[PDB]
């Protein structure tokens, strides 16, 4: 059984488990069909690309317009530029608005 | 804005243009750098450096046979083209660049979680070269034979003895 | 390693610009239902230097959290935040006890690290005598396991790899107590 | 990253020598960047329509699926 | 075996001194590298071990009983190609010195042999890309080994072009269904049969029909044949398509397991196209080798529909089909390669030029064969009747197969059009057969003492002298033979295909 | 299909070989001097220049001896290899075989020797070792490793079969013998 | 970090490098998308089961 | 591709036409017509057509042949035979 | 756009214009590969990337060979 | 790891290369403060290609043999073997022996290639001229 979906650091990467259980299901000989195996399918296409899970996002989000809910107070705050992830927006005690470093570590 | 999509637009109106074989010689090194920095800017530096470690030796070479082979023909030929007609082309083709059509895929956006399980931390190289040593060793043996044919090939194509 | 991913802070703002990279704050706190715990406060180079003391006082916390870990069967962040906070209260314990016992010795070393690029080989002397006050009154020694006590490299009498800069305080500090200690 | 450091200069040699047909080229470059920034929706409208007279599921149409479902649902409890 | 005996012959060919005989006596070294290499095969591979299937090199290669038999039938036939090029096929010398001029070309075969029966075995997309290469560089690499032929370059040239292009459509094939799934085994990505898009692997058959010629690409493969000297049209024209179509068929036997209809459709329409072209195609030509090319497009469109049909029927008739095939198609260009001894000499209208690659390159060129060797011309009537589906010649039973895996799976119109076919091109291979006889009672007392084969001399007058060398007349003799002969041991060769298995087991 | 026991699913380099029966060799020659010999017949056959015999040149027949060489050892290699798997009739092979290994077990050490390799890589060379030898005549691969994925069960090996009572070898557990994996993940599950 | 998750600009806008037999289906051919989008209405309607 | 597209009243017509631009006794050419007595040139005014007619056709009469040459019907025999198209280069052909 | 086959006016009208095309054409599946193998952290595919690369530069080198003997064809008078 | 310090610097590049070809033209006395010969555009003697004083055929668009054509194509099969070992290198202790014996390997096949240059002498320069020495000879009566 040749390796797949190998991580950046040469082991398992995020989805490899889900690869894993799908052949063990499918080469075990206690079934019958490979229906068993089916929603294990899923989960590992899941994994990869999370096309449901993007999906229930985007009904989210348009259930949110149709009753008039803001975006920008149900959602999660963000910010843009990396260079403004200020000690104010971290919540620091003595945060400050100024610039943070990101030139050279 | 995205300085990318500018960078193809001028590159697909040259492409459009283009007349002699010099200026193809150009577009391919008018595409791989562009290549290059979106690699090396979005997805993979590796790769990004690879690209340029091998196309241009290939890009080198075949511009030297170029030399041994213009012919005259399409400096003075002429033609036609009209400019309504270029820009016509590349309006119509710059509307559609959505190469998928789930929506979801590509409007919603993702993030990973690290984990700090990776202790052993080495670059991407490493384990390509891990792998490719290891389990895909007879891919890399494969591609040697290949490169040594490659080898004979261009002999007993080229040389007249 | 300078991969991009979509898990941390990438390069560039060339990157975030190409990817639209929204760095996205949750303003909830863990449920009520969950019980509290203060995390570590420590940064990058008091937890190198910390880093072998707290595996010599943690080592049945650490392992029993691991071991958590392989057992969950992929519920793994969920079964075991009784067993991390095990964790974290440990290592916590740690740092505070070097703050009150080995205060001076011990931000000496990870000055050094600082210093230094966080090179272990680069901080012997400042790390010798940090070794020496946590051992006398932790009763902890750093330990690298699966080889001879006697071939760990921190122990190494003339190490081929040395710092080109010497670090001021460290040879200072390391003078005073050869003096003082070793008569 | 070759690109940054040539694109002033193939720019700058693109109005020099085609002014008109880079003019034309820029000015369009900058109107769409106007329809993504401003949100006039022009592109995203071509889009919907494309996905409408090929056959793909529109953004309308996973919608009214939503909605054939609420309804749906709703009676099956009431 | 291959691999290491082909280090030595590269190395040994570059050491000694350039001659006509030590290249001669370099690819009998060659005929006895692949005789080891098939006794080294049969000791080792038997249809009942490898009925289950086996993986080899971490899983990138799988070898079956029907994989197993479509390499040893290579083996085979690339065993009689290589007796063309390591003995006389004529005997003269300003004929046969052609194939010993070129030292490299006993290398390129064996690069070539090694691609073919790899191609088969791939079970990883990595690994069919590469391999896939292999097989295509080799070929253009033999399509311009005669570099000073400016045909036989121009042919590779357009070779490259059309393959590249191809294998561009088999890498974008594979790289999509990476992207879909992640995985790169075939046996991994078996497990998501049912999930992928399964016209990304019509994509990826795209690209392989156009590396056999198939319609609407048609037409590179026929200009290729008739512009490359008959030694090289031999070889390129019959060994692609023994390792593509098995491996197209054990493509299909893997898609036919979601039973997508609408992919069978498309494969439908192109078998019906390309029947209409390679039987219309022919009609009017007056080169032997393009006829011959369109006689390639029709049979592969034949068994395409065993291909397409792909069930237990369709193992036997495509295993059939594709061995009596090639020996149809070896025997065929062994006799125009030694008929070449019968043509005229001047001593003109429409300024016909002949060149030393191709003496004989028009159909007219084949007259009064039947005075000239009645023993080959009744041969050559033989493979061609065969072609036809003369019964009980070989051919009829490759067509009688075909139908019947054809029509079990409800394909009548292909099965009603490719008979159609067949009775469409029985025209232009009837004028090959009017061409090689009917004018001999109008001819038999003429005095032709211009011949080529006139030309050479006689040892004593005493002696008997034989006019075809030894080892092509055998072959000949051999096949021909097989071709008329086997109705006698047809019901013990259809029992051993009933034994090749696909995954079948029960 | 006359099926025999398996001995070894990827049998190593030097056992192959020293398994070899006098036949084994006596076609390791046929193969050698085969070659060259095919070069003869070809030429009594048919003359490669004009009508009349004449002896291929000295070199031509070295480089078939070495060609035959090769060839001969790899149908001896084959030929030896179908014993190991019980495709071929192996019962000379077994009773040597558990010669070998019981005489091991008993010194403690293991069957198939310590390997330099870790364990994935004992792992992935019987991945990419095994089942080679069907592809042997196109290409050559061999096991040369001490790796422990050979298809068998070492309590096998536990059970005395008739003409194995003279041994009297005293088998320890398979948790007491050096380098085996069951006797080798003792302090940590993923180090051995 | 989220971040959108799209294929390279000089892949969908190159006048070239975009054409291919796949990238053609994946754009112009709904054959793909009308099976993935079953299996995301299976999500909402296998709520109540 | 490489082979002539002549026919013999078309090198006659664009023959007629070209000794045509001269200034000939009569502007009734034939085959049969000849140089000397009914178009009226001396040795000059006979190169300078033989070297029109040769940019006409590209075609390069032999210093035997123009040296001998009387009718006009020998100058249409002669393009006939003799004219081929000019190579191409690599591209033009095979694209 | 595509489907009425515009990239056919974007290729040159020189053998060696399709050369570049077939080369820029084989890119477009590498930085496809390149873009699914980072996205999923998967080191199969960037093997499968870097196999791509090599054996493209291949093909440009067997194809250019064919396309030099093919000049020399011509200029065969070589009476110098 | 952060590269925007990197990016300050190739935007630098960019446009510092920018300032020379400005910079000279900007400082350059126009041409009617000079002799005043006209733009540079109609000076057809001064923009003509340099050919020592004499004009000669205009071949710019002809062909030009290229007598290292066989090296050139062979520097690509080659390029491609030096960039192969650049995974090895990365690398080497995590393969071990295995992946150095793989490394030898990887090198064995290609020496073959090495071998095969040499001995067909296919690295030489491709000369038009021979230079070969007559026998002068007398048939005598
Ligand atoms: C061993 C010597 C040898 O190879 O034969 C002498 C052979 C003949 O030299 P020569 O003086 O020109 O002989 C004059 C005749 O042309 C030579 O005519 P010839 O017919 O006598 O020699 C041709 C030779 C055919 O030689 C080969 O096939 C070379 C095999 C290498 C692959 O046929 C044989 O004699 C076969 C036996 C000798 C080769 C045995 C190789 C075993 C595999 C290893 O020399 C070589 O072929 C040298 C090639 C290898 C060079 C070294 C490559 C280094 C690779 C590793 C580098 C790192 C360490
Ligand atoms: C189209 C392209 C296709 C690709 C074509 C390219 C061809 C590639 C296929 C070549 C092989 C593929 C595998 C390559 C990866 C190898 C990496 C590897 O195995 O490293 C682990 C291996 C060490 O790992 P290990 O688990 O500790 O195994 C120890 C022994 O190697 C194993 O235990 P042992 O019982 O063998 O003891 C060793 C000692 C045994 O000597 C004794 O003490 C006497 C015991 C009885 C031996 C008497 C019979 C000897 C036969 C003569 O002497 C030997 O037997 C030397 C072993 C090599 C024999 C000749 C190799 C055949 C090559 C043909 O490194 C090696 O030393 C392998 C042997 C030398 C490398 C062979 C290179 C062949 C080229
Ligand atoms: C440091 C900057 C270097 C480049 C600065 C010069 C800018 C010119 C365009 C650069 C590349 C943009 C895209 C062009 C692709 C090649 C098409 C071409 O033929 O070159 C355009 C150039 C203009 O000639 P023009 O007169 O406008 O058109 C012919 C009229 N019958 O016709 C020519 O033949 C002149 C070409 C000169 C040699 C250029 C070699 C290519 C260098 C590309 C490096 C940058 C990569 C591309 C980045 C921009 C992408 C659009
Ligand atoms: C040299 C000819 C040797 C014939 C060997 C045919 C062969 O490969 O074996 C039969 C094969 C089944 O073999 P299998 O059962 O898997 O392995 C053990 C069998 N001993 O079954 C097969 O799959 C063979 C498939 C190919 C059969 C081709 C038939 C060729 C007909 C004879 C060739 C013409 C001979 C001309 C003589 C010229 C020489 C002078
Ligand atoms: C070991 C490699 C070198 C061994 C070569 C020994 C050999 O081939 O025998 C010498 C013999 C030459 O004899 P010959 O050339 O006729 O007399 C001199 C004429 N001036 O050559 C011969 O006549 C050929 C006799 C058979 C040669 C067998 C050599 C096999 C090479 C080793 C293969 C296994 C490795
Ligand atoms: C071929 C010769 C291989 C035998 C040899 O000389 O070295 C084998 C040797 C393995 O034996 P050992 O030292 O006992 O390993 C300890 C296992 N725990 O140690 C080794 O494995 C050293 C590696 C042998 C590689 C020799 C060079 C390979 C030849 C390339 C051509
Ligand atoms: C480092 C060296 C710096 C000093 C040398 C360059 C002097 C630049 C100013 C200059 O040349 O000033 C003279 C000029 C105009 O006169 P011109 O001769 O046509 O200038 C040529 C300049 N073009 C090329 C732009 C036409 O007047 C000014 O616009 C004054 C400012």
Same mark, same amino acid.
């Given at each position: 059984?040749?390796?797949?979906?190998?991580?950046?650091?040469?082991?398992?990467?995020?989805?490899?488990?889900?690869?894993?259980?799908?052949?063990?299901?499918?080469?075990?000989?206690?079934?019958?069909?490979?229906?068993?195996?089916?929603?294990?399918?899923?989960?590992?296409?899941?994994?990869?690309?999370?096309?449901?899970?993007?999906?229930?996002?985007?009904?989210?989000?348009?259930?949110?317009?149709?009753?008039?809910?803001?975006?920008?107070?149900?959602?999660?705050?963000?910010?843009?530029?990396?260079?403004?992830?200020?000690?104010?927006?971290?919540?620091?005690?003595?945060?400050?608005?100024?610039?943070?470093?990101?030139?050279?570590? | 804005?995205?300085?990318?999509?500018?960078?193809?637009?001028?590159?697909?109106?040259?492409?459009?243009?283009?007349?002699?074989?010099?200026?193809?010689?150009?577009?391919?090194?008018?595409?791989?750098?562009?290549?290059?920095?979106?690699?090396?800017?979005?997805?993979?530096?590796?790769?990004?450096?690879?690209?340029?470690?091998?196309?241009?030796?290939?890009?080198?070479?075949?511009?030297?046979?170029?030399?041994?082979?213009?012919?005259?023909?399409?400096?003075?030929?002429?033609?036609?083209?009209?400019?309504?007609?270029?820009?016509?082309?590349?309006?119509?083709?710059?509307?559609?660049?959505?190469?998928?059509?789930?929506?979801?895929?590509?409007?919603?956006?993702?993030?990973?979680?690290?984990?700090?399980?990776?202790?052993?931390?080495?670059?991407?190289?490493?384990?390509?070269?891990?792998?490719?040593?290891?389990?895909?060793?007879?891919?890399?043996?494969?591609?040697?034979?290949?490169?040594?044919?490659?080898?004979?090939?261009?002999?007993?194509?080229?040389?007249?003895? | 390693?300078?991969?991009?991913?979509?898990?941390?802070?990438?390069?560039?703002?060339?990157?975030?610009?190409?990817?639209?990279?929204?760095?996205?704050?949750?303003?909830?706190?863990?449920?009520?239902?969950?019980?509290?715990?203060?995390?570590?406060?420590?940064?990058?180079?008091?937890?190198?230097?910390?880093?072998?003391?707290? !595996?010599?006082?943690?080592?049945?916390?650490?392992?029993?959290?691991?071991?958590?870990?392989?057992?969950?069967? !992929?519920?793994?962040?969920?079964?075991?935040?009784?067993?991390?906070?095990?964790?974290?209260?440990?290592?916590?314990?740690?740092?505070?006890?070097?703050?009150?016992?080995?205060?001076?010795?011990?931000?000496?070393?990870?000055?050094?690290?600082?210093?230094?690029?966080?090179?272990?080989?680069?901080?012997?002397?400042?790390?010798?005598?940090?070794?020496?006050?946590?051992?006398?009154?932790?009763?902890?020694?750093?330990?690298?396991? !699966?080889?001879?006590?006697?071939?760990?490299?921190?122990?190494?009498?003339?190490?081929?790899?040395?710092?080109?800069?010497?670090?001021?305080?460290?040879?200072?500090?390391?003078?005073?107590?050869?003096?003082?200690?070793?008569? | 990253?070759?690109?940054?450091?040539?694109?002033?200069?193939?720019?700058?040699?693109?109005?020099?020598?085609?002014?008109?047909?880079?003019?034309?080229?820029?000015?369009?470059?900058?109107?769409?960047?106007?329809?993504?920034?401003?949100?006039?929706?022009?592109?995203?409208?071509?889009?919907?329509?494309?996905?409408?007279?090929?056959?793909?599921?529109?953004?309308?149409?996973?919608?009214?699926?939503?909605?054939?479902?609420?309804?749906?649902?709703?009676?099956?409890?009431? | 075996?291959?691999?290491?005996?082909?280090?030595?012959?590269?190395?040994?060919?570059?050491?000694?001194?350039?001659?006509?005989?030590?290249?001669?006596?370099?690819?009998?070294?060659?005929?006895?590298?692949?005789?080891?290499?098939?006794?080294?095969?049969?000791?080792?591979?038997?249809?009942?071990?490898?009925?289950?299937?086996?993986?080899?090199?971490?899983?990138?290669?799988?070898?079956?009983?029907?994989?197993?038999?479509?390499?040893?039938?290579?083996?085979?036939?690339?065993?009689?190609?290589?007796?063309?090029?390591?003995?006389?096929?004529?005997?003269?010398?300003?004929?046969?010195?052609?194939?010993?001029?070129?030292?490299?070309?006993?290398?390129?075969?064996?690069?070539?042999?090694?691609?073919?029966?790899?191609?088969?075995?791939?079970?990883?997309?990595?690994?069919?890309?590469?391999?896939?290469?292999?097989?295509?560089?080799?070929?253009?690499?033999?399509?311009?080994?005669?570099?000073?032929?400016?045909?036989?370059?121009?042919?590779?040239?357009?070779?490259?072009?059309?393959?590249?292009?191809? /294998?561009?459509?088999?890498?974008?094939?594979?790289?999509?269904?990476?992207?879909?799934?992640?995985?790169?085994?075939?046996?991994?990505?078996?497990?998501?049969?049912?999930?992928?898009?399964?016209?990304?692997?019509?994509?990826?058959?795209?690209?392989?029909?156009?590396?056999?010629?198939?319609?609407?690409?048609?037409?590179?493969?026929?200009?290729?044949?008739?512009?490359?000297?008959?030694?090289?049209?031999?070889?390129?024209?019959?060994?692609?398509?023994?390792?593509?179509?098995?491996?197209?068929?054990?493509?299909?036997?893997?898609?036919?397991?979601?039973?997508?209809?609408?992919?069978?459709?498309?494969?439908?329409?192109? #078998?019906?196209?390309?029947?209409? #072209?390679?039987?219309?195609?022919?009609?009017?030509?007056?080169?032997?080798?393009?006829?011959?090319?369109?006689?390639?497009?029709?049979?592969? /469109?034949?068994?395409?529909?065993?291909?397409?049909?792909?069930?237990?029927?369709?193992?036997?008739?495509?295993?059939?089909?594709?061995?009596?095939?090639?020996?149809?198609?070896?025997?065929?260009?062994?006799?125009?390669?030694?008929?070449?001894?019968?043509?005229?000499?001047?001593?003109?209208?429409?300024?016909?030029?002949?060149?030393?690659?191709?003496?004989?390159?028009?159909?007219?060129?084949?007259?009064?064969?039947?005075?000239?060797?009645?023993?080959?011309?009744?041969?050559?009537?033989?493979?061609?009747?065969?072609?036809?589906?003369?019964?009980?010649?070989?051919?009829?039973?490759?067509?009688?197969?075909?139908?019947? /895996?054809?029509?079990?799976?409800?394909?009548?119109?292909?099965?009603?059009?490719?008979?159609?076919?067949?009775?469409?091109?029985?025209?232009?291979?009837?004028?090959?057969?009017?061409?090689?006889?009917?004018?001999?009672?109008?001819?038999?007392?003429?005095?032709?003492?211009?011949?080529?084969?006139?030309?050479?001399?006689?040892?004593?007058?005493?002696?008997?002298?034989?006019?075809?060398?030894?080892?092509?007349?055998?072959?000949?003799?051999?096949?021909?033979?097989?071709?008329?002969?086997?109705?006698?041991?047809?019901?013990?060769?259809?029992?051993?295909?009933?034994?090749?298995?696909?995954?079948?087991?029960? | 299909?006359?099926?025999?026991?398996?001995?070894?699913?990827?049998?190593?380099?030097?056992?192959?070989?020293?398994?070899?029966?006098?036949?084994?060799?006596?076609?390791?020659?046929?193969?050698?001097?085969?070659?060259?010999?095919?070069?003869?017949?070809?030429?009594?056959?048919?003359?490669?220049?004009?009508?009349?015999?004449?002896?291929?040149?000295?070199?031509?027949?070295?480089?078939?001896?070495?060609?035959?060489?090769?060839?001969?050892?790899?149908?001896?290699?084959?030929?030896?290899?179908?014993?190991?798997?019980?495709?071929?009739?192996?019962? &000379?092979?077994?009773? &040597?075989?558990?010669?070998?290994? &019981?005489?091991?077990?008993?010194?403690?050490?293991?069957?198939?020797?310590?390997?330099?390799?870790?364990?994935?890589?004992?792992?992935?060379?019987?991945?990419?070792?095994?089942?080679?030898?069907?592809?042997?005549?196109?290409?050559?691969?061999?096991?040369?490793?001490?790796?422990?994925?050979?298809?068998?069960?070492?309590?096998?090996?536990?059970?005395?079969?008739?003409?194995?009572?003279?041994?009297?070898?005293?088998?320890?557990?398979?948790?007491?013998?050096?380098?085996?994996?069951?006797?080798?993940?003792?302090?940590?599950?993923?180090?051995? | 970090?989220?971040?959108?998750?799209?294929?390279?600009?000089?892949?969908?806008?190159?006048?070239?490098?975009?054409?291919?037999?796949?990238?053609?289906?994946?754009?112009?051919?709904?054959?793909?998308?009308?099976?993935?989008?079953?299996?995301?209405?299976?999500?909402?309607?296998?709520?109540?089961? | 591709?490489?082979?002539?597209?002549?026919?013999?009243?078309?090198?006659?017509?664009?023959?007629?036409?070209?000794?045509?631009?001269?200034?000939?006794?009569?502007?009734?050419?034939?085959?049969?017509?000849?140089?000397?007595?009914?178009?009226?040139?001396?040795?000059?005014?006979?190169?300078?057509?033989?070297?029109?007619?040769?940019?006409?056709?590209?075609?390069?009469?032999?210093?035997?042949?123009?040296?001998?040459?009387?009718?006009?019907?020998?100058?249409?025999?002669?393009?006939?035979?003799?004219?081929?198209?000019?190579?191409?280069?690599?591209?033009?052909?095979?694209? | 756009?595509?489907?009425?086959?515009?990239?056919?006016?974007?290729?040159?009208?020189?053998?060696?214009?399709?050369?570049?095309?077939?080369?820029?054409?084989?890119?477009?599946?590498?930085?496809?590969?390149?873009?699914?193998?980072?996205?999923?952290?998967?080191?199969?595919?960037?093997?499968?990337?870097?196999?791509?690369?090599?054996?493209?530069?291949?093909?440009?080198?067997?194809?250019?060979?064919?396309?030099?003997?093919?000049?020399?064809?011509?200029?065969?008078?070589?009476?110098? | 790891?952060?590269?925007?310090?990197?990016?300050?610097?190739?935007?630098?590049?960019?446009?510092?290369?920018?300032?020379?070809?400005?910079?000279?033209?900007?400082?350059?006395?126009?041409?009617?403060?000079?002799?005043?010969?006209?733009?540079?555009?109609?000076?057809?003697?001064?923009?003509?290609?340099?050919?020592?004083?004499?004009?000669?055929?205009?071949?710019?668009?002809?062909?030009?043999?290229?007598?290292?054509?066989?090296?050139?194509?062979?520097?690509?099969?080659?390029?491609?073997?030096?960039?192969?070992?650049?995974?090895?290198?990365?690398?080497?202790?995590?393969?071990?022996?295995?992946?150095?014996?793989?490394?030898?390997?990887?090198?064995?096949?290609?020496?073959?290639?090495?071998?095969?240059?040499?001995?067909?002498?296919?690295?030489?320069?491709?000369?038009?001229?021979?230079?070969?020495?007559?026998?002068?000879?007398?048939?005598?009566?």
């Amino acid at each position: 059984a040749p390796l797949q979906q190998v991580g950046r650091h040469g082991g398992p990467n995020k989805c490899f488990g889900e690869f894993q259980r799908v052949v063990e299901c499918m080469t075990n000989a206690k079934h019958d069909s490979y229906e068993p195996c089916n929603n294990l399918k899923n989960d590992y296409l899941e994994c990869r690309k999370h096309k449901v899970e993007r999906y229930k996002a985007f009904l989210m989000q348009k259930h949110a317009e149709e009753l008039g809910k803001d975006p920008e107070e149900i959602g999660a705050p963000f910010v843009r530029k990396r260079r403004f992830l200020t000690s104010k927006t971290l919540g620091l005690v003595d945060g400050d608005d100024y610039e943070i470093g990101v030139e050279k570590i | 804005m995205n300085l990318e999509i500018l960078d193809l637009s001028i590159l697909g109106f040259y492409s459009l243009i283009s007349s002699n074989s010099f200026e193809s010689i150009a577009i391919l090194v008018a595409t791989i750098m562009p290549v290059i920095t979106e690699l090396w800017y979005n997805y993979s530096q590796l790769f990004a450096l690879l690209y340029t470690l091998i196309y241009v030796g290939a890009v080198v070479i075949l511009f030297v046979f170029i030399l041994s082979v213009i012919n005259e023909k399409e400096e003075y030929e002429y033609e036609y083209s009209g400019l309504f007609i270029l820009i016509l082309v590349l309006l119509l083709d710059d509307l559609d660049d959505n190469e998928s059509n789930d929506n979801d895929y590509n409007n919603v956006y993702i993030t990973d979680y690290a984990d700090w399980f990776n202790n052993y931390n080495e670059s991407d190289l490493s384990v390509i070269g891990n792998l490719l040593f290891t389990e895909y060793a007879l891919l890399l043996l494969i591609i040697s034979f290949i490169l040594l044919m490659s080898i004979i090939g261009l002999i007993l194509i080229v040389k007249k003895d | 390693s300078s991969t991009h991913t979509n898990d941390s802070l990438n390069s560039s703002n060339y990157v975030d610009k190409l990817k639209d990279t929204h760095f996205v704050f949750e303003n909830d706190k863990l449920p009520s239902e969950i019980p509290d715990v203060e995390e570590v406060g420590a940064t990058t180079a008091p937890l190198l230097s910390a880093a072998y003391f707290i !595996g010599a006082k943690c080592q049945d916390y650490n392992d029993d959290f691991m071991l958590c870990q392989k057992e969950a069967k !992929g519920n793994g962040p969920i079964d075991c935040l009784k067993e991390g906070r095990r964790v974290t209260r440990c290592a916590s314990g740690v740092l505070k006890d070097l703050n009150t016992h080995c205060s001076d010795e011990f931000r000496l070393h990870w000055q050094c690290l600082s210093f230094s690029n966080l090179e272990y080989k680069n901080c012997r002397k400042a790390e010798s005598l940090l070794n020496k006050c946590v051992f006398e009154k932790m009763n902890l020694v750093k330990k690298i396991p !699966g080889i001879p006590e006697d071939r760990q490299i921190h122990l190494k009498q003339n190490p081929v790899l040395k710092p080109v800069a010497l670090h001021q305080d460290s040879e200072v500090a390391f003078k005073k107590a050869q003096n003082e200690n070793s008569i | 990253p070759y690109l940054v450091a040539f694109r002033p200069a193939v720019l700058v040699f693109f109005f020099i020598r085609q002014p008109i047909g880079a003019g034309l080229l820029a000015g369009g470059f900058l109107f769409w960047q106007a329809d993504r920034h401003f949100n006039f929706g022009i592109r995203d409208n071509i889009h919907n329509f494309k996905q409408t007279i090929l056959g793909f599921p529109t953004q309308a149409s996973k919608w009214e699926t939503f909605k054939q479902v609420d309804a749906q649902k709703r009676a099956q409890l009431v | 075996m291959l691999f290491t005996s082909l280090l030595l012959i590269i190395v040994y060919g570059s050491l000694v001194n350039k001659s006509h005989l030590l290249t001669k006596l370099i690819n009998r070294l060659g005929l006895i590298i692949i005789i080891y290499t098939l006794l080294i095969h049969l000791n080792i591979n038997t249809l009942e071990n490898l009925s289950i299937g086996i993986n080899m090199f971490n899983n990138l290669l799988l070898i079956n009983s029907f994989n197993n038999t479509i390499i040893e039938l290579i083996l085979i036939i690339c065993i009689l190609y290589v007796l063309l090029i390591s003995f006389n096929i004529t005997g003269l010398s300003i004929i046969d010195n052609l194939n010993y001029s070129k030292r490299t070309f006993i290398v390129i075969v064996l690069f070539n042999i090694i691609g073919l029966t790899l191609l088969p075995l791939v079970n990883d997309i990595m690994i069919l890309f590469i391999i896939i290469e292999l097989q295509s560089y080799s070929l253009y690499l033999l399509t311009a080994i005669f570099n000073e032929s400016h045909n036989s370059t121009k042919s590779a040239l357009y070779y490259f072009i059309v393959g590249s292009i191809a /294998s561009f459509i088999i890498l974008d094939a594979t790289v999509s269904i990476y992207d879909d799934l992640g995985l790169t085994n075939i046996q991994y990505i078996l497990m998501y049969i049912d999930k992928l898009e399964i016209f990304d692997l019509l994509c990826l058959l795209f690209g392989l029909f156009i590396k056999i010629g198939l319609a609407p690409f048609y037409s590179y493969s026929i200009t290729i044949y008739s512009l490359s000297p008959t030694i090289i049209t031999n070889y390129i024209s019959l060994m692609p398509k023994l390792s593509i179509l098995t491996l197209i068929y054990i493509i299909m036997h893997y898609i036919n397991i979601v039973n997508n209809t609408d992919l069978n459709y498309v494969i439908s329409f192109l #078998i019906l196209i390309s029947m209409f #072209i390679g039987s219309f195609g022919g009609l009017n030509v007056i080169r032997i080798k393009t006829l011959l090319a369109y006689s390639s497009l029709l049979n592969v /469109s034949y068994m395409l529909l065993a291909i397409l049909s792909n069930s237990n029927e369709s193992i036997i008739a495509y295993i059939y089909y594709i061995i009596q095939y090639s020996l149809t198609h070896i025997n065929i260009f062994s006799i125009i390669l030694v008929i070449s001894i019968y043509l005229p000499i001047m001593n003109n209208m429409l300024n016909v030029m002949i060149t030393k690659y191709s003496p004989i390159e028009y159909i007219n060129q084949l007259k009064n064969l039947f005075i000239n060797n009645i023993f080959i011309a009744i041969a050559l009537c033989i493979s061609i009747f065969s072609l036809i589906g003369i019964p009980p010649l070989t051919g009829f039973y490759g067509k009688y197969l075909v139908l019947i /895996s054809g029509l079990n799976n409800g394909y009548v119109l292909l099965s009603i059009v490719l008979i159609i076919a067949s009775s469409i091109s029985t025209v232009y291979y009837a004028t090959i057969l009017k061409v090689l006889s009917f004018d001999t009672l109008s001819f038999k007392d003429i005095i032709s003492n211009n011949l080529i084969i006139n030309t050479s001399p006689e040892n004593n007058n005493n002696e008997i002298k034989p006019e075809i060398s030894n080892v092509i007349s055998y072959v000949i003799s051999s096949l021909t033979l097989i071709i008329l002969l086997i109705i006698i041991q047809y019901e013990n060769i259809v029992k051993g295909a009933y034994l090749v298995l696909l995954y079948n087991w029960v | 299909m006359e099926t025999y026991e398996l001995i070894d699913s990827d049998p190593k380099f030097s056992r192959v070989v020293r398994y070899f029966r006098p036949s084994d060799y006596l076609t390791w020659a046929l193969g050698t001097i085969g070659a060259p010999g095919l070069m003869v017949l070809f030429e009594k056959i048919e003359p490669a220049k004009g009508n009349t015999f004449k002896m291929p040149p000295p070199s031509i027949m070295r480089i078939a001896t070495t060609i035959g060489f090769f060839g001969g050892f790899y149908y001896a290699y084959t030929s030896s290899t179908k014993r190991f798997w019980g495709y071929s009739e192996n019962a &000379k092979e077994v009773a &040597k075989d558990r010669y070998e290994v &019981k005489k091991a077990l008993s010194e403690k050490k293991s069957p198939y020797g310590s390997s330099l390799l870790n364990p994935y890589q004992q792992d992935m060379s019987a991945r990419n070792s095994t089942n080679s030898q069907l592809l042997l005549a196109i290409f050559p691969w061999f096991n040369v490793a001490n790796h422990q994925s050979h298809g068998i069960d070492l309590r096998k090996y536990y059970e005395v079969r008739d003409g194995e009572e003279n041994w009297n070898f005293t088998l320890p557990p398979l948790d007491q013998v050096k380098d085996l994996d069951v006797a080798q993940y003792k302090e940590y599950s993923n180090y051995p | 970090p989220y971040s959108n998750t799209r294929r390279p600009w000089v892949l969908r806008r190159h006048i070239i490098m975009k054409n291919s037999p796949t990238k053609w289906a994946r754009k112009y051919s709904s054959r793909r998308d009308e099976r993935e989008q079953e299996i995301k209405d299976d999500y909402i309607r296998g709520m109540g089961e | 591709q490489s082979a002539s597209t002549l026919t013999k009243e078309d090198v006659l017509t664009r023959s007629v036409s070209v000794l045509r631009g001269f200034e000939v006794k009569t502007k009734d050419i034939d085959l049969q017509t000849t140089f000397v007595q009914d178009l009226g040139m001396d040795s000059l005014d006979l190169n300078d057509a033989l070297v029109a007619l040769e940019e006409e056709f590209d075609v390069v009469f032999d210093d035997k042949t123009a040296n001998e040459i009387k009718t006009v019907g020998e100058v249409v025999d002669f393009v006939l035979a003799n004219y081929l198209p000019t190579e191409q280069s690599i591209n033009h052909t095979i694209r | 756009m595509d489907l009425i086959l515009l990239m056919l006016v974007a290729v040159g009208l020189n053998i060696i214009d399709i050369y570049i095309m077939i080369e820029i054409l084989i890119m477009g599946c590498t930085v496809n590969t390149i873009y699914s193998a980072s996205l999923d952290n998967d080191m199969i595919g960037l093997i499968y990337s870097l196999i791509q690369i090599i054996i493209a530069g291949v093909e440009s080198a067997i194809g250019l060979s064919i396309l030099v003997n093919y000049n020399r064809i011509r200029n065969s008078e070589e009476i110098e | 790891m952060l590269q925007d310090l990197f990016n300050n610097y190739v935007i630098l590049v960019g446009i510092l290369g920018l300032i020379f070809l400005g910079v000279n033209y900007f400082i350059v006395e126009s041409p009617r403060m000079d002799e005043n010969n006209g733009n540079i555009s109609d000076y057809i003697e001064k923009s003509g290609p340099f050919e020592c004083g004499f004009s000669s055929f205009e071949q710019s668009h002809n062909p030009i043999p290229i007598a290292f054509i066989l090296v050139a194509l062979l520097f690509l099969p080659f390029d491609l073997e030096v960039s192969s070992m650049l995974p090895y290198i990365v690398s080497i202790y995590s393969v071990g022996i295995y992946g150095l014996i793989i490394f030898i390997l990887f090198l064995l096949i290609l020496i073959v290639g090495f071998i095969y240059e040499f001995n067909t002498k296919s690295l030489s320069i491709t000369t038009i001229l021979h230079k070969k020495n007559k026998a002068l000879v007398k048939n005598l009566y």
